[PDB]
Ligand binder design. Structure first.
Ligand SMILES: O=CCCCC[C@@H]1SC[C@@H]2NC(=O)N[C@@H]21
Ligand SMILES: O=CCCCC[C@@H]1SC[C@@H]2NC(=O)N[C@@H]21
Lengths: 941, 941
């Protein structure tokens, strides 16, 4: 083969040497090997041809005239070319010049002749070809047409004989026209007249293969005619009739999943580029995986979930109130790590210990495992589905109620949503096995809590209304958040139909005396209502606070596994179990089971050393009674301060946090209000501002977006109202939200969103995907693109996820039950000319290689811009950030306070505003430019 | 396969996992995989079985009772064993106990269970087996019996279907009994009931293979039933009738060359272990290949070889004498590099310039390209065939006579050979295209020269008798090698029928006055004889010496290409051509052609920088008139002195060379006599001996083997005889050779040697291989083993041969005309657990990997031994070397001068002898031990 039948000079050289060529005559090989001559012969034989130029085109102008006459699409083809090279389809006039030039250069390089011709492009043709056989006596026998339509880039891959579902009349036309064409040239060998068949059943001649084709074999199998025997005997001078070959005697006789490669691509990416998750501290994960304790064979014992499923939320609440002793709940699944390892704990590690929890802790009130930061963090930083985590944990723990932290009018998100999104989220959360909804508001703003309670109750969930605790009820000088404030809010939440009343001490402010006073007052007022107390051990007094709550008549307290307790986490489970043992408050939890649970979590916490709060805080700190910083905010505020170069000033940041809380009006501090106070505190320290200076200059200063959105009312109304005149000075003419922010939002069309997601990602979009996109559109889009590239990263152990494999390291990855990948990392190559490294693996005893991309290998940048602090017209970047939008151009008049650009840094759009009226002289920045602090954005005159 | 159908626990584990096992049920696999259970079922089905025990035998007594009942021969078989292991035939009672014990131990070791059973041994059975197929509906279709009787140690080798010449009634019994057996167990897959058929046509069941056998293919080819399709469809639950399978429808129908991998293995070896050729200096080969000058298209012009081929040796000699002008000859092909790069120039580089030489230097008298050191060095260090070099150069240069340096009674070797080897060497050299034989002796010993002249003349070669020049014929104080000595030897060589007379000045001692005197005296005596003068430019006077010879009536002078001339090489070709231009001695060689030739060789010499004499000698040196060290010996003696730690004492070595020459009797100094003087000079300097001390202590000292063999007479007799009493003192009672050393050697049987080589290396042994083995047995053996491992290394360029490729380096290797390898080196791995590195290549766009061996990666040793110089009984190693042989043991009495051990260092067996009479107290060395200088060999008391 090798397209040698195109050439005749070899056939002639055989004849001149006195050696027979077993094929057509040199004249027939020449006539049929020239596509222009062969086409002219086909027209003369009355065989239909594709509409096309009669000669090779010499100019782009002839291609333009052809395109005007026949319309697009058209195809350029090399006049002297075979095998699919030097061919270009053109769909439009804009493409014509580029594709002509490329087709010409490719034809010149491949065939030594750049001559092109133009044809009409037949869209979605069948490639049908007819086997012919001729003798030296002018007998021509055709053979049944084959189907060669299964092609990759115009190369044949699979060939079928006869053509499947071909119209018998079309078959007769194809075979008759092949025999006519062959007779017209005096053809004398096995050969193949090729056609394109359009969707309307018209056939068009394209080319004749004068060489026994690769696919002759399927014709032999359906005709019982040995083509190579026939070729030899014809070259001996035998006639087709003498071979028994007559036309009347010839009859017809009879998305791939790539999960393993995507995982190897992730592992190769981490080996070349480092961790894909941002690492805050230079600590390495443990090299040893945690030891999983032994679990009994069988279903776990019946728990409080069996009561909830049998008797509903009110039956569950009565069973909790009637329980003899103290009930505990496990927050290790979410709250404990959110505080200690910043919610980085992966579904992989949670699943390993889940069967042990189900068997040995079946008497837990609930396990807190989802809501708070876990929803965003799972998608954004762990690249895993939070819903799959819920479903898989629910299968492994069938007997313990699952609890989530729900914001009342915001669900698990950072902004307000239309009510129908919050309702649909609670419905789908309950369907996926969520049982208890701890409904809180960041300001205790009752209208937001009532919506979340109604949404959770309408879903059929246990409504736990949570009052966020701030201040000190035992301090008579703190009048704003008095005992009467808490009692009055509890009365409104009980009237709203809460099944359980929670006190949420998010910072660890509840002193044992305040515990006794608050919990006894609530118990005396509500004798039949279950009381749930949540605290943090930030002060090192959380165990004593929870014992005081239990003695004052709390039915439930929040605890964590001992190795996941203390500091900014919950009180120790083992400490509470040991201290209540043999009292009327005994939890009946065996201490040995708490130890085995803690040992697993000690090993697992070692995998997260890169995120551990102990890198920055070695113990609990009693300054929390002054600063009131929540556990998860303390860790985040420290990492942010270090990233901004304020790490040495963190004591000033804590002092500014107290001042910022007062300036803002001493509001409750929990996500997102704790972040708003944090951003203001960092802003004050960064700019060297005292409270009095920041309040005096409030009309001139560009406050953090979170502070502005709070003052606008986007998170609800704080107790006692907003601080005036401070709010009016910061907002100026900015729009204000009155009442509940979600109440003015139009309902989101979830069916329109589902359709958009199906169009973008394919038919596997679920209701969980729609709700994830509705709450977190950019995060969900990034998560889908990332998992489309790298596959199911939840299958990797946490060390391999964070650091990848070492060279010569061998490990196992379970994709599904009974599908293990044995993977060994072998080598990483040097950088190629495309800026890629080749990573080599063994996968199930076989060499694999993946091309990866090393940005670190080739990284450089330059920052021009500086703003003179003394020149009011020079606008510097107020933070390191990326330019999202530029609102002004050079020569534009700008008013004082007018938006100039939008920076996106630390996951917060900051609008940079004009400090003066003037004319923009020059803009120094571009869209997507990265700026450092004080980089010159623009000049104003 | 692997006898896995014996096991059912896998079939059960598939069923328990919900995965279909494509085979019989786990119960059928168990029943049929147990030979005792399967046999009991065969008896119950009425199928004949071999007479045998009903249970596994527990005692030798049960084997005795069985043997009494059934008679011998019997066979022990493992009860739980397959594949012919744990089986023993017993022919007699004397064999019963041994064979039982062996069969039991083999069964226990192979299968974990020693249980045996006894059967009657069927003598000379046919092994006939029947293919069965069953479905889940109880349909069983048998297929025709196969013949598996062609066995080696009970393993099947050749299988036939149907069984050849099988009785049709026996076939029907076999197939009926297989179908009965299969029905009795409810069999459900393709399977094989096996039988032994005796010489009387009785069949006996042995075993059923429940796994699609290796030999199923011959059954498919005779039945047109795809067994694997049938196995799959039966496992889908289809019936045999629904598959069209009914018994009535089933009928009977009737060394690879690895050159590219071996080259990649060499390149990988050099990348891991470094150069395979010993590198004397820390210089790197040039990264640039030499530019080959343009060659005319066509055959080269007629030269002096066309005269030689037309008119024979005497016609050639007359044409040389009658030539108007000075003829030149090119030593560059051999002598020039032997002196400068120590003969490391490869066939690869010689071939590249050969066509240019043929066209532009067609008037050369000859080109010297083979003999001297080139024969051994090509095989030993370049791993290339010297004969292939001769043949390929002869094809490329058809028109210039080829010249070799031939030792008269030793050919190109280092020892004397039987005469028939020297004659056969000259014959095969002439057949391979050698034209001129420069016959010399290292001592001008006429009887050795006459044999070499007769051998070369009898082959039909041009005999050039060469007188080796030493001394100064212009110095009347040097009486030993006077003008009369040279004239008298010339008369004897002319009387012996030399065609050409050569003066070989191997050191560059011929001063212009001595040239004039010697050459004019020879010309006056022999007016019609061609005179050829060879010198070296070691003194920097060689050009002036050759001009004086040409003026005195020399017809030919030796020259080298300018970049390969001077120093220890020949005089410059360009200098001689330029100095004779426009005189009666004009060479008619165009200077531009000499420049292009020199430029190629300048580039090529850069590839050999690692061997260049300029590492040690920056110019010619006139001290050669005092030391008389030949060019090639100077370079070698310096490298040896540096390897022995005497490099800083090389001036003392040159002085000791003069003293050693005198002590030995002032013999001519050329290979091997120049080495003998060199070894003595190094020995004197190493031991701090003056001439007078070495002559006084000659009975006590252990001289170098080369000096001893010289004094014995193994190289011939020196002019003036051996030095007495020095010879008698060194030799003592050692055997003396009188006369010509080859004359007492029995003829070598070359046909016996050819047969030995064919038995060792296969049928590709040539007459050239036989002669190479006859002259250099150990070198030739090593060369064949090396080229068997690494392939045709002559195809590699010289840089890649010496240093291998760099990582990411791409290069071409031409194996044959039109067969190019594109090779890229990609990576080298770390050391594996087997002490190997994996080297990765791209070969013709494809990844290749080779496992190589890094001795350097894992190299360590320890030397205990030291000999106190003051303790006469402590025998130290006289040189660094390897222990070849140990001649004595502890407790042996030894006489003074008795051989103690043989050391092999610097390619020279040195016998270590006792300095005293005594008893060997202790031997400290082992065979193959490597010793340093002064390492304690043994103690004598
Ligand atoms: O880096 C960006 C923020 C990542 C999430 C931080 C969570 S949101 C829930 C909790 N409350 C806070 O103020 N921060 C953490
Ligand atoms: O390394 C061992 C010796 C290698 C060959 C040396 C050659 S033999 C021809 C010539 N004459 C000498 O004395 N040495 C060189």
């Amino acid at each position: 083969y090798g397209f040698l039948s195109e050439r005749a000079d070899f056939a002639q050289a055989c004849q001149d040497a006195g050696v027979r060529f077993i094929g057509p005559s040199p004249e027939v090989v020449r006539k049929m090997g020239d596509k222009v001559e062969a086409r002219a012969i086909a027209i003369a034989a009355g065989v239909p041809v594709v509409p096309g130029t009669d000669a090779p085109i010499t100019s782009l102008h002839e291609a333009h005239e052809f395109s005007n006459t026949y319309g697009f699409p058209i195809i350029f083809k090399a006049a002297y070319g075979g095998g699919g090279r030097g061919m270009r389809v053109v769909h439009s006039y804009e493409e014509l010049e580029e594709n002509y030039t490329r087709a010409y250069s490719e034809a010149l390089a491949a065939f030594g002749n750049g001559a092109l011709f133009v044809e009409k492009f037949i869209e979605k043709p069948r490639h049908i070809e007819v086997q012919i056989l001729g003798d030296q006596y002018g007998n021509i026998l055709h053979l049944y047409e084959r189907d060669c339509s299964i092609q990759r880039r115009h190369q044949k891959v699979v060939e079928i004989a006869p053509a499947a579902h071909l119209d018998p009349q079309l078959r007769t036309r194809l075979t008759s026209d092949s025999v006519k064409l062959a007779k017209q040239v005096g053809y004398e060998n096995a050969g193949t007249v090729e056609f394109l068949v359009d969707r309307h059943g018209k056939h068009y001649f394209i080319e004749v293969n004068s060489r026994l084709q690769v696919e002759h074999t399927v014709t032999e199998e359906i005709t019982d005619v040995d083509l190579v025997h026939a070729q030899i005997h014809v070259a001996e001078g035998r006639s087709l009739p003498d071979l028994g070959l007559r036309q009347e005697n010839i009859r017809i006789n009879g998305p791939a999943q790539n999960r393993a490669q995507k995982l190897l691509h992730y592992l190769g990416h981490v080996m070349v580029n480092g961790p894909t998750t941002p690492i805050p501290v230079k600590a390495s994960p443990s090299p040893t995986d945690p030891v999983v304790p032994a679990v009994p064979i069988g279903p776990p014992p019946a728990g409080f979930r069996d009561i909830l499923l049998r008797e509903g939320p009110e039956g569950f609440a009565r069973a909790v109130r009637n329980h003899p002793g103290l009930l505990l709940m496990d927050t290790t699944f979410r709250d404990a790590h959110q505080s200690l390892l910043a919610t980085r704990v992966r579904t992989h590690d949670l699943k390993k210990i889940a069967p042990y929890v189900a068997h040995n802790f079946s008497k837990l009130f609930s396990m807190e495992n989802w809501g708070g930061a876990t929803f965003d963090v799972a998608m954004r930083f762990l690249y895993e589905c939070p819903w799959r985590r819920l479903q898989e944990l629910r299968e492994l723990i069938p007997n313990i109620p699952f609890q989530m932290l729900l914001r009342g009018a915001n669900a698990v998100g950072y902004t307000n949503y239309p009510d129908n999104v919050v309702f649909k989220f609670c419905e789908v959360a309950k369907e996926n096995g969520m049982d208890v909804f701890r409904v809180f508001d960041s300001l205790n703003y009752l209208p937001n809590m009532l919506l979340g309670m109604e949404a959770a109750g309408s879903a059929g969930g246990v409504v736990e209304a949570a009052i966020s605790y701030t201040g000190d009820v035992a301090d008579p000088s703190r009048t704003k958040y008095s005992l009467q404030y808490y009692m009055g809010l509890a009365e409104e939440l009980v009237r709203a139909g809460t099944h359980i009343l929670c006190i949420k001490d998010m910072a660890g402010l509840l002193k044992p005396t305040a515990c006794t006073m608050l919990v006894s007052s609530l118990r005396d007022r509500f004798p039949d209502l279950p009381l749930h107390i949540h605290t943090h051990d930030t002060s090192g007094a959380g165990v004593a606070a929870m014992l005081a709550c239990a003695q004052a008549g709390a039915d439930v307290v929040d605890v964590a596994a001992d190795s996941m307790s203390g500091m900014t986490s919950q009180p120790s489970m083992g400490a509470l179990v040991a201290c209540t043992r043999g009292t009327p408050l005994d939890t009946e939890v065996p201490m040995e089971r708490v130890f085995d649970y803690s040992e697993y979590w000690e090993g697992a916490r070692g995998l997260y050393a890169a995120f551990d709060c102990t890198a920055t805080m070695k113990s609990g700190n009693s300054d929390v009674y002054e600063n009131e910083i929540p556990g998860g905010q303390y860790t985040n505020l420290h990492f942010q301060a270090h990233s901004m170069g304020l790490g040495s000033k963190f004591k000033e940041v804590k002092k500014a946090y107290v001042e910022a809380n007062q300036m803002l009006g001493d509001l409750i501090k929990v996500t997102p209000s704790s972040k708003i106070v944090g951003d203001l505190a960092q802003f004050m320290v960064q700019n060297g501002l005292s409270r009095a200076e920041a309040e005096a200059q409030a009309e001139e200063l560009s406050f953090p977006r979170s502070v502005v959105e709070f003052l606008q009312g986007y998170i609800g109304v704080p107790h006692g109202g907003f601080p005036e005149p401070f709010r009016s000075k910061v907002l100026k003419d900015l729009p204000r939200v009155e009442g509940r922010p979600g109440a003015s939002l139009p309902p989101l069309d979830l069916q329109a969103l589902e359709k958009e997601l199906v169009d973008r990602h394919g038919e596997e979009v679920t209701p969980e995907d729609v709700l994830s996109a509705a709450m977190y559109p950019d995060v969900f889009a990034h998560f889908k693109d990332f998992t489309a590239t790298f596959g199911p990263l939840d299958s990797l152990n946490t060390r391999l996820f964070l650091q990848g494999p070492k060279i010569a390291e061998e490990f196992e990855v379970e994709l599904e039950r009974g599908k293990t990948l044995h993977i060994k990392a072998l080598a990483v190559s040097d950088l190629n000319r495309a800026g890629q490294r080749q990573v080599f693996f063994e996968l199930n005893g076989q060499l694999r290689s993946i091309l990866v991309k090393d940005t670190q290998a080739m990284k450089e940048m330059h920052f021009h811009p500086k703003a003179l602090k003394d020149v009011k017209g020079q606008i510097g970047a107020p933070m390191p950030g990326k330019v999202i939008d530029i609102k002004v151009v050079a020569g534009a008049k700008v008013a004082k306070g007018q938006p100039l650009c939008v920076l996106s840094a630390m996951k917060m759009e900051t609008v940079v505003t004009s400090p003066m009226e003037g004319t923009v002289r020059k803009v120094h920045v571009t869209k997507d430019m990265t700026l450092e602090g004080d980089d010159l954005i623009l000049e104003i005159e």
